[model samples]
Target: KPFSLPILTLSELTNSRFPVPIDSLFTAQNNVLQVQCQNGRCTLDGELQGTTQLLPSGICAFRGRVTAQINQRDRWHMQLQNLNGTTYDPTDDVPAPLGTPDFKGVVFGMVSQRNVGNDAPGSTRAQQAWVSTYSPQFVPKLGSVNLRISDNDDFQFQPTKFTPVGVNDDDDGHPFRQWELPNYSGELTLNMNLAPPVAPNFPGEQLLFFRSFVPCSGGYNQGIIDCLIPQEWIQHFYQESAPSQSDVALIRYVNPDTGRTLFEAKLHRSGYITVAHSGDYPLVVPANGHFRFDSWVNQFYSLAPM
Candidate 1:
């Protein structure tokens, strides 16, 4: 069953614009910065920023990053709640869904993960992946709800992150938790830095930062329709299948505005994906991406007349 929560309204002028900066939307005080690598001493600090753009009615882009410590065994996470009426889930105490779809109208956000340690004692390697999903307001297109992990891992991520994948599944009892992978650890710490600042005149007092969809050129017509199952069928698939074989293509979407395609890939089988993306919150499924993930108390903002 869908949960309900309070809605955030957008200001009049900034309703439809692009690349707007939301000042101070994200502020992080340096938390515990301990380097777990044996014999390798390290220090840490963090800066986070974001921007929002109104592409067209019903469409927008919000992106940002946090730069901090990346070490082994240690874990770091962040959560952005969109604060809109539609994305809210009244049933959950936290007021958000664990794995909502992207197009259902909820915006996508980014999560980082990288671990490092020597094979024997303390070796350092790093890797990270972003998460996304569709919205419930939209019909559950055959394989609409999807998750994606980037092919590129910044800097030292290569030695740390590997191919095919690994996974950690903590959400075993949830009705929607279709897949599960055990504590498949990695090297890099999932640290995100703030987005570069926008021009001073940008609209909106806040920017809704989300996981940017990796744009795909061309059409899906050329690609094979691997699988076309409904959400209910997906639920059944999770209940019946082993976590390892559940590596599904999940979804392939064509953004009508940009003429680009996006593939939401899941690797429950490879043991690559995990709930580590959920910061402050301990239990969350990366599959749920939406406004509920907004980091703001008020998700939208108004801009000065253009």
Candidate 2:
């Protein structure tokens, strides 16, 4: 007598929370199985070949074909291309040769309250606050800024300085201070060279800005801009009893004309949670079309404690 295992679809294999036992007992004949489904689809077999591993958590991992769709709104759409540790833009689609000089990055401060007392210096006592850090690099050429091939690629920029620009200042007539005590301002300015095939309309100087709460003390330290997450969404976390964690998401910019990857950006989330309970949920990307993401089991947990 011969024993056989039931055939599983790509969807079924991925959704199984418990590790699927793969051995001689199971045979995939004239059928296909997919693992790590992402930007493209990958297949696997019963022979237990290819990239597969078993984790200490009793989870089995394998690599399979994935799929991704490209959209016009994506930063990489049509403009950027990735090469060997480098990224470039070929103005083939556009009418005239165009070069992007002013590659600006802006940081915004979130709404929050501050603690005013002789407790600690620069201490923020807010119920909710957005906190993040960013470090960007650009290639330099002939005293100008140029694009790089990939995020991991080694690149250097000019000194590129930042100036303290006033955002908000509170003029509290305190006996200890004559003028404003807590003054908030944003930092600005970065210098970089333009890449080759530079457009005629490129700006001579490139600048980037870093914005956040300054001297997080005194009265309500709301900056020049006040961006807040919805209260209802914030309340959802208080209703849950799960522990807080952090997660990461990666975004890659690719040139459509040559299919070369230009750069990659990583986004970090704190106090994150997954809404879904199970399945092999990898990030989704689209191919020359609207990007769609399949429902995953998690979401960002609130940083503020309920």
How do all models score by TM-score? Answer: 0.17, 0.15
lDDT of 1 at 129: 40
Every candidate's lDDT: 0.20, 0.20
Range of the 10 consecutive residues with the lowest summed lDDT in candidate 1? 39-48
Q: For residues 151-177, could you state the per-residue lDDT of candidate 2 as single tens digits?
A: 212211211111112122223232211
Encode model 1's per-residue lDDT on 152-233: one tens digit a residue. 3443221121111111121222121111110111122121221221111222221111111122222221111011111222
In lDDT terms, how accurate is model 1? Answer: 0.20
Cα RMSD (Å) between model 2 and the true structure? 25.8
Clashes of each: 62, 44
Q: Which stretches of candidate 1 lie over 4 Å from their true place?
A: 1-92, 97-113, 116-306
